[PDB]
Amino acid sequence: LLSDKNVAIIGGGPVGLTMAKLLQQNGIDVSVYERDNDREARIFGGTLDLHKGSGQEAMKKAGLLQTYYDLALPMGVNIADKKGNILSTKNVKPENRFDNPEINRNDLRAILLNSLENDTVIWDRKLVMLEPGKKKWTLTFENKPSETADLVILANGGMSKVRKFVTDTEVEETGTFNIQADIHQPEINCPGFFQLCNGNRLMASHQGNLLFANPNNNGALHFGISFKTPDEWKNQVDFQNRNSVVDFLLKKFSDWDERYKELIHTTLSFVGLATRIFPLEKPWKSKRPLPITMIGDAAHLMPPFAGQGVNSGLVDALILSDNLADGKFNSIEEAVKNYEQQMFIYGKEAQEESTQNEIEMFKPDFTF
């Protein structure tokens, strides 16, 4: 295959690790440079789920579907109202288990990580600078020895600072905002809400305030509250100390049932983040010194309320990965050129749904 050279993937998230695996399956030489300190760093967030057709195809090809099923956990979902009434409830039906079981972000990385040869990932590696060499890239790492690569694959999230050689387009705030926390022993610390989820993911929407929870992410309750960014914050409240956040949440939620409030009372620390999108507007630099591309969130960061992200990114993995091994191209530049073409197709389409959908809710109504 077209790589008797060496690849550098920047980013050990689910998309970056899948790349690594798909390449290394074909005897390609890959290293993943991850900035997490070690294998064991906690990944904050909800649970991923892999769709048939996309995410799961990624896993089928990596020879990892069964392992994914093993560790994943199917979940019904309830729609509830501001009051605690279950409006709807779709349960796991035996036949449709495998459609999209939820997996914990750390568990998934354990699966991927386990599938790579030793020392494929190089930990404690924060990429800060890239530089086109004679015939290969030079990667700069904060207070760590530099490295070289014939191909660089950016897979380092939606805030990647090293996007320039591919495009001058930059991420943008979408208009909405997300607060989220985890509650441990949710069954005694927030029994009302925990009992309300009754073993299913829970969602409720009220006057443009979204509450979404999963009662069982490896035994913790994860939840997030989303909303249109308050007119004032121009980019002012502080997620450092919680009394600030609690007053704010408890305000826009005073309307809501005591059970949800108890959710905002027990949570010890909150993390705030503005929804962003890396818009697939114009084409990317046709003029590139050395081979380089982007997959997953680096390529098309988009709002999550649709259910998008990662599947779309794992598809990137799949598609690029094949292009560079099916020998159906006479050069690397061609193969990446082609992948970037296909992904612009379904990328724009996804980003279209999620954006529009984001506008749907966060209005004065919704019904999922």
Ligand X SMILES: Cc1cc2nc3c(=O)[nH]c(=O)nc-3n(CC(O)[C@H](O)[C@H](O)COP(=O)(O)OP(=O)(O)OC[C@H]3O[C@@H](n4cnc5c(N)ncnc54)[C@H](O)[C@@H]3O)c2cc1C
DSSP-assigned letter for residue 361: B
Q: Using the rule CB under 6 A, is 291 a contact of ligand X?
A: no
Q: Identify which of residues 2 and 8 has a Cβ nearer to ligand X in the complex.
A: 8
Residue 14 marked in a binding site: yes
Q: What is the CA radius of gyration of the chain?
A: 21
Size of residue set near ligand X by CB under 6 A? 28
Ramachandran quadrant class, 85 (left: phi over 0; alpha: psi -120 to 50; beta: rest): beta
Q: Using the rule CB under 6 A, is 33 a contact of ligand X?
A: yes
Q: Identify which of residues 35 and 261 has a Cβ nearer to ligand X in the complex.
A: 35
| Neighbour count for residue 103 (Cβ, 10 Å) | 25
Write each residue from 176 to 195 as x if it is in contact with ligand X (CB under 6 A), else as -, in one continuous string.
--x-----------------
CA nearest 210: which of 271, 260, 269? 260
Residue 201 marked in a binding site: yes
Contact between 166 and 154 (Cβ < 8 Å): yes
Contact with ligand X (CB under 6 A): which of 157, 186, 215, 291? 157
In single-letter form, the type of residue at position 63 comes to G
Residue 42 marked in a binding site: yes
Q: Using the rule CB under 6 A, is 347 a contact of ligand X?
A: no
CA distance 132 to 148: 10
Contact between 81 and 206 (Cβ < 8 Å): yes
Alpha-helical regions (H) of the chain: 14-24, 55-61, 65-71, 105-115, 186-189, 191-197, 242-252, 258-266, 296-300, 311-323, 332-360
CB of 153: closest distance to ligand X in angstroms? 11
- Name the one range near ligand X by CB under 6 A: 83-91, 239-247, 258-266, 308-316: 308-316
- Name the one range near ligand X by CB under 6 A: 27-35, 189-197, 241-249, 349-357: 27-35
Q: Using the rule CB under 6 A, is 223 a contact of ligand X?
A: no
Angstrom distances, CA of residue 22 to CA of 27, 29, 166, 305: 9, 11, 23, 28
CB of 41: closest distance to ligand X in angstroms? 8
Q: Using the rule CB under 6 A, is 296 a contact of ligand X?
A: yes
Residue 242 marked in a binding site: no
Contact between 123 and 34 (Cβ < 8 Å): yes
Residue 310 marked in a binding site: yes
Residue 36 marked in a binding site: yes
Contact with ligand X (CB under 6 A): which of 31, 46, 56, 354? 46
User: Tokens 């099923």 sit at which residue?
Assistant: 69
Q: Using the rule CB under 6 A, is 11 a contact of ligand X?
A: yes
Q: Using the rule CB under 6 A, is 51 a contact of ligand X?
A: no
Contact with ligand X (CB under 6 A): which of 309, 315, 318, 347? 309
Contact footprint for ligand X (CB under 6 A): 10-16, 33-36, 46, 48, 125-127, 155-157, 178, 224, 296-297, 304, 309-311, 313
Which residue positions form the known binding site?
Answer: 14-15, 33-36, 42, 49, 105, 127, 180, 201, 297, 307-310
Which residue positions form the known binding site for substrate?
Answer: 180, 201
